[PDB]
Amino acid sequence: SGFRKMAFPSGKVEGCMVQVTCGTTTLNGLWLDDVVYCPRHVICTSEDMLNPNYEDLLIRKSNHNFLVQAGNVQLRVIGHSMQNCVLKLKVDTANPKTPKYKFVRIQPGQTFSVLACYNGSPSGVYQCAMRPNFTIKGSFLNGSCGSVGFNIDYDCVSFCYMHHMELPTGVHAGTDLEGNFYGPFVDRQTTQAAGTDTTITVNVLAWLYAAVINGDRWFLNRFTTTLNDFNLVAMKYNYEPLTQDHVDILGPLSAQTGIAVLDMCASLKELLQNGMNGRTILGSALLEDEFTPFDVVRQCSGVTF
Amino acid sequence: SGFRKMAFPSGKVEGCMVQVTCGTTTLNGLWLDDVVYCPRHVICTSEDMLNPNYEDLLIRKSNHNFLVQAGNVQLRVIGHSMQNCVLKLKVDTANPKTPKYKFVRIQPGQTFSVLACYNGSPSGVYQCAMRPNFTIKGSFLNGSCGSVGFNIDYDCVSFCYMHHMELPTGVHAGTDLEGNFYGPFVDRQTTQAAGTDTTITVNVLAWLYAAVINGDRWFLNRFTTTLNDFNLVAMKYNYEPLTQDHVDILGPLSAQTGIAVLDMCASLKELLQNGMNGRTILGSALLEDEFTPFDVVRQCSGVTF
Ligand SMILES: *[C@@](O)(c1nc2ccccc2s1)[C@H](C[C@@H]1CCNC1=O)NC(=O)[C@H](CC(C)C)NC(=O)c1cc2c(OC)cccc2[nH]1
Ligand SMILES: *[C@@](O)(c1nc2ccccc2s1)[C@H](C[C@@H]1CCNC1=O)NC(=O)[C@H](CC(C)C)NC(=O)c1cc2c(OC)cccc2[nH]1
């Protein structure tokens, strides 16, 4: 027992990280098979950054302008192209450590692990959720671009995220591995605003189930509610509306624990209206929304890779 | 910017995890060079577990009774011995993935990463602190024994923890890699109580520095205090006494931010006496004590491995 914010083991992704240098800009890339993926603004200089013409910068580049290093070793670049906000560099050597992988685009509310890297080297790993406003609450400094987010299913790495920018509020934005941004952001050196964020209701409920499983059960109350009545309260506290699909995906946890989903919703309503009165749940004084239902089951049942 | 509970990249440790089976008991082991380390109570069955005579059980075992598997491959056991609560199995093949490593015994308040494993396979990675009462607040189920905790410094893995048991209150206890428990616990199937725990004051202060660096500054007050006056308050709120060494190690953060250590202490005092009034710091509604000063600097400055 116990309940922690747990990341996936990072080893399979660690062996894919490289450094990509153009002019004096260095960022991280992802070496899979004979292709290296990285943010396209590696091709930017300090004068190009406010409103770059990436088509114009790229046509002028040559293969030999891109310095790709995998640890101590230079890779030879034999072709290049741009896909949305990502550059693809073809190199003459397939990565021998390439895992089984796929590229996925995740939905808001879904979770993934980030391997923060600098200069093609790992710094650390942590779990994130895609916020409803399409940001992530990450930890990234200068040089972190091209760090990736991922899930693992047995032996298959699903890459979902590549890091591009920090917004004013100190939250983070990036792309999928086809180079399309999550949210309405663009890769230019300019100020952009994340929308108002909301709390991921279905994850909060999943985590209340985790709490019950772990013996934290003080917040279970004597009430039930309806989806509609709960939603009146969710709108008030900036929670995502609960949908039928959400009720549905909480079904397994509900059956495991014998606590009906709408009874847990009633317990959540009371927590929102009454606060926590200085108490804690799973060691937190806030209601946690960065565990999905899948995450709770995985952790509470000990799934491995 | 941003500040997250960050684990070390787990790749170098993932390559060392194996499965060790005796009779019907399977737990995890750590394969370094030509030795496999695992909890000694792999040699227990259900009759032996309440008060095992490990000397008698081990003298009666032979090399061939221990089944060691790395992936789908059996390793051949060519010797065995016991050191405190750890069994050491000599095998005929040195682990080709052995990283640079050492064994360290850490002090209360220090942090490390856990790679939770089942059946010799990794499940997930998370950061823990050694609590003042020598427990850890982990996430471990049946089968997790022999999972290890570690720090990384450049290319060197310092192993500090091997998992052995869960205590009544849902916290966790284990040994260093020489098989000596942290705390007064023993490896027998019996109820044992952790002492009352206390908050790791120097870590709370480090995290308040992290907050200031990341722009969270509302709690900075207009007061200073002394070590002795602060300690009067720490005793009251079950905080570890702050010592001169603690003040000392906060020096770099203090110089970076221009906020004197005792001024930060005075800010902490006010937070303890007044509470947070429903506000948050680095997205937490509690004062977080599982980041060391070292951790804050590493994360805020982008150190890599
Ligand atoms: C990433 O590491 C990159 N750095 C560079 C440097 C030169 C060329 C290309 C790149 S990509 C970097 C990651 C950031 C830094 C701090 N935390 C992070 O997560 N990303 C950027 O610096 C990014 C580059 C753009 C070309 C996309 N810009 C921003 O994150 C950014 C720019 C602004 C801004 O511009 C006027 C105003 C406010 C906020 C802001 N963030
Ligand atoms: C670990 O995976 C092991 N399992 C076995 C099974 C058979 C033989 C040896 C071992 S080691 C296991 C990890 C636990 C399970 C749940 N969460 C964990 O972290 N450790 C144990 O099960 C451990 C074995 C002892 C021989 C050291 N025992 C306990 O954790 C334990 C025993 C008691 C108890 O006994 C009467 C009362 C209360 C609490 C308790 N915990």
Numbering used by the authors:
A (entry chain A), B (entry chain D): 1 to 305
From the article:
The present X-ray crystallographic and virologic study demonstrates how SARS-CoV-2's main protease (Mpro) inhibitor resistant variants emerge when SARS-CoV-2 is propagated in VeroE6TMPRSS2 cells under inhibitors’ selection pressure. The X-ray crystallography data with mass spectrometry data obtained in the present study clearly show that all three Mpro inhibitors specifically bind to the enzymatic active site of the enzyme through the formation of covalent, polar, (and halogen) binding interactions, causing the dimerization of two enzyme protomers. Each inhibitor blocks the entry of the premature viral polyproteins into the active site cavity, thus presumably blocking the enzymatic processing and maturation of the viral polyproteins. In conclusion, the present data show that the structural changes in the target enzyme (e.g., Mpro in the current work), which certain amino acid substitutions bring about, compromise the enzyme’s integrity (e.g., protomer dimerization and the following structural changes), loosen the binding of potential therapeutics to the enzyme and cause resistance.
